[PDB]
């Protein structure tokens, strides 16, 4: 089978379509796609929780995603295919800062803290960014 391979191929073209990630030299790119892990979830379900342990970098390829902190939770904004979180735990405190939830049938390219710090780390997009 060459699914694996198609799907590589997949995975770069789309972390191509994100300007976050088209600094990227092409080796790590791939390197990207191989290490990222599709993963899925349904409307209500929680990506991060708010005051857990940060491991994990997330890219939207499918839906959309609330973002919510706990004051009767505040309600901070919605990102969509291409947007991108959790990296505020992937650097000094590992904390999460707030939740993320699925507000539909979402998919996201999901890579642990070695991968990013290896691979991501210090993109000045990801990590000095404001908002
Ligand atoms: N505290 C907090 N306040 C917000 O207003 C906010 N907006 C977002 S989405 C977003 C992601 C990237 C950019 Cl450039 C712009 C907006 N996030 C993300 O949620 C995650 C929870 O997990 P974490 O590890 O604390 O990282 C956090 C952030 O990625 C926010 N976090
Ligand atoms: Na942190």
């Not at 959309?64 to 004051?71: G, L, S, W, Y």
């Not at 295919?81 to 390219?109: H, M, P, S, Y």
Request: charged share 25%; proline share 2%.
């Amino acid at each position: 089978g060459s699914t694996g391979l198609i799907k590589h191929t997949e995975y770069m073209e789309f972390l191509k379509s994100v300007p976050t990630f088209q600094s990227l030299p092409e080796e790590i790119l791939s390197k990207l796609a191989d290490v990222l892990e599709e993963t899925h979830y349904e409307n209500g379900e929680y990506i991060i929780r708010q005051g857990a342990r940060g491991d994990t970098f997330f890219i939207i390829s499918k839906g959309t995603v609330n973002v919510t902190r706990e004051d009767d939770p505040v309600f901070l904004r919605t990102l969509g295919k291409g947007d991108w979180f959790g990296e505020k735990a992937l650097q000094g405190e590992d904390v999460r800062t707030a939740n993320v939830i699925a507000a539909e049938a979402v998919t996201c390219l999901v890579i642990d803290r070695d991968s990013f710090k290896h691979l991501i780390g210090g993109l000045d997009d990801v990590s000095n960014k404001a908002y």
